[PDB]
Design a binder for these strands. Sequence first.
RNA 1: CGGCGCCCGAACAGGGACUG
DNA 2: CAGTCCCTGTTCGGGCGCC
Lengths: 412, 555
Amino acid sequence: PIETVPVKLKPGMDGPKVKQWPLTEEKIKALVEICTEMEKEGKISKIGPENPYNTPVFAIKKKDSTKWRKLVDFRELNKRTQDFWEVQLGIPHPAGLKKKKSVTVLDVGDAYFSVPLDEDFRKYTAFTIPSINNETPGIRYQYNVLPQGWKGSPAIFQSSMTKILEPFKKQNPDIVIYQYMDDLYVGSDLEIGQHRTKIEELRQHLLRWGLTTPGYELHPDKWTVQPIVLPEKDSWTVNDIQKLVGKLNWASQIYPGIKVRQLSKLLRGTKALTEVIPLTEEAELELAENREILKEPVHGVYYDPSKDLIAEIQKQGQGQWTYQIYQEPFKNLKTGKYARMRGAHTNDVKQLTEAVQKITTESIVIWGKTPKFKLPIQKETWETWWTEYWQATWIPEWEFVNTPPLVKLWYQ
Amino acid sequence: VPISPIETVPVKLKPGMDGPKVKQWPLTEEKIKALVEICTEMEKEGKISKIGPENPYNTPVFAIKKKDSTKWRKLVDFRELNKRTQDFWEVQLGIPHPAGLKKKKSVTVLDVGDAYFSVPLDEDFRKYTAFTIPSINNETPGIRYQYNVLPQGWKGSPAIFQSSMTKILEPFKKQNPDIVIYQYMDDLYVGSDLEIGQHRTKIEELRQHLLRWGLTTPDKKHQKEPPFLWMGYELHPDKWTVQPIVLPEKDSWTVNDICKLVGKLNWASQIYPGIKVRQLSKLLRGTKALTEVIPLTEEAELELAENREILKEPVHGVYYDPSKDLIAEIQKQGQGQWTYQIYQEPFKNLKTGKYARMRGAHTNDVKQLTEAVQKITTESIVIWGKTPKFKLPIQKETWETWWTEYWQATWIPEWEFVNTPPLVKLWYQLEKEPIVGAETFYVDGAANRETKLGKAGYVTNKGRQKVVPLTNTTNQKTELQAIYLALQDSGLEVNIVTNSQYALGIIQAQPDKSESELVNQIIEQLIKKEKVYLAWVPAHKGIGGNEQVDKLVSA
RNA sequence: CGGCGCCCGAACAGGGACUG
DNA sequence: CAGTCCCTGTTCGGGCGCC
Ligand SMILES: Cc1ccnc2c1NC(=O)c1cccnc1N2C1CC1
């Protein structure tokens, strides 16, 4: 018996009508035992054909966890409430969160299950638990409490959260606390022992305030940026100068003071690719002036709050992957590289899945926003397994690309 | 007062809308006098009512015909009401595949009578039902009425039926965990691993539970009928098969004959292994009229032949045994056609199938295999909810070379090698580094957009040149064309420098087949070489023999 | 009248390169 | 800077197969 903040699908658009994708029996079982238990708790309840709305659901285990977590893909719903949450209630994003020697992510989403949900909105949380082989029809529910992974859920719980936290925040003013969807980011410059202790302490806070919390540590102060770099060479084959000049031409799409002119003249005749050509000095100086123009920061790159972030991922081989975050071509807010992730040397889709998750995480720690991915993968491939390797409680936005590599040379 | 059978569904209306009013459109004259009476029948059973003032609602009649009936069936058209009624989440999500069924000792089928008329319509929506249709010809102006149950051709009839039915069966199911029911339309199929009599026990005890809600199940019902006939399937508790397929032997071949033919072949392909539709699918390419005349080629007939011999002997699928692993083994059938079998105990198949689909302008066998494996995983999840172990005609080294080199993210799940030629191979590899002491060809091609005219040629470190004039071409084709030249005129090892990003993209993805004859030729030359290193440089940067080439070709 | 499987033909996104 | 083309690559409306 408490109020309910009415919520509306922003103007003109209807509830999500999206199809449930086939699930593995493993996951269908886990969902069945979770929803039947959640029905008993009156968190959710059964629905009829009079509700023509659907959101997809599946299940995951978080990293190093043997427990099945239910996960709803609320992206379409999240878009029409997108306007609800974005225009009505804001969360100021700490620019300092990124500077902490440590940042832990605690999953507080369970708390959202306290609060009731506006009775008029509930028909939009509709989800089907599918059946193997279409043997039964689907088991359909809708949400009674604040549904996990919806953006309205952390929005509406904002007040209550700031409350439950205010003792700790007040007692510990120097610790930074951010909240992104079902996750709460807590970070500090404390030496790691006492950090982990302050995290246990916060766990206690929400534990005694009526919350449960099913490592999470990050190290943002150590996050490195991948600069573009031209090789250091003794002797240059024709082929070396060629790869150099072409790479240099791309880089000059990013950094305009680059000139290929004298190195180009270096390539002048028709010479064997493997012939060793000495570097004229005028070109040698053009090249050195280039390595220089390549250690500076790119003019006019700054984050703009209104624009969406875009992340591009390239597969570099032998377990390495490079990425770039940007809002406008050639102006990159960040570039980076990953290697020896889980799946390295055996499963590309696993590795990429991992990559998309680490990129999203830094994107949230840095701008408090998830990027839109350009994924180097076939559509169908990705849809099939990505559902298998996902350890995150959120789901970025993505589209699929084919780019035979001339941009691959974000790496040696 | 009428009476109240089973829980009702809250059907609403599309906001800001109200019931329809329409004029009649023609329907055959003899049978419709019958419904005037039939309507009075329903009055007494509870399926109809009427009021004079209260209905601003009227609906017409338009129909579709069905074969095989020994008595006539009445009908009404709500199509205007339909368009005006709320949408539902549809209950028929598609059908189970026979190969996905677990083997059941005992399997029966109860057929529900008065199925649609056994379901209460939403109280308040009842109002919207009113309709009118011609007596025999006509005499007096008429009268009208409303529906108290699920009306024919209405959207909620199927959705709400299915759901209500489900709700009823639920307590029976919960009180009977080891029975197994499946609902298709108005038929229920029940099965158990229990003994034959306790099985018929629960069959009546369930006709009880269905009756308690008013659902009538007669005894023309058959335990002595299985195989059950369902959607082209024949189903025995132990084994399933497709219903018998008739392949036309007709001497006269129209493209529509080949069409029906193909459709029959694919449907056969779920069970009879090794079906090839390729050449038959080739006939269908780009035809204006469905009535056109087409002859059968020797290939299409040799295919039709091998297929006729596959269909000759009969065959049956087994069912799934959850205790045992699933196995999917794929064999390359050539001409970018693939077949796979999914079984558990060796030589006993759950099902078979083809993957023939040619994806992309230029492709290769590894890619196509990867695709089939993906298709198959999907099919396996829908049906058995798990991924099979895969048996594939590809060396673990072949594959490792491919997936690890390719620029895209790519994967096959847990799988092992099967030496079952043809084995899938990569027919050439490009070098990762320039080849010492190989001639180096700088290549170019160019064409003029207006005249559609151009030339393709090259220059080398050895002094060797060539320029070939070409007619009716494009910029891309000339750049391919130049690479082709460098291949033909070069020795067993060669470095080729191209400034065509396009051509480089194609060759670098190592195609073994192409729609494009020129690419096919490039491929053939590529396969003949010992070492080929292919490189890219930017145009008009004044590079190398490319500035020199550029002048000669661009001239 | 309707879903699914497939084949066939048309409209939009990415990229290249030319017209001063 | 607009406006032309040439390639490649998914989405949507047209007939068979199964109800
Ligand atoms: C057509 C059909 C569709 C779905 N399931 C069944 C059936 N009917 C069967 O013939 C059947 C046969 C064998 C095992 N299960 C069957 N059953 C399941 C009920 C035990």
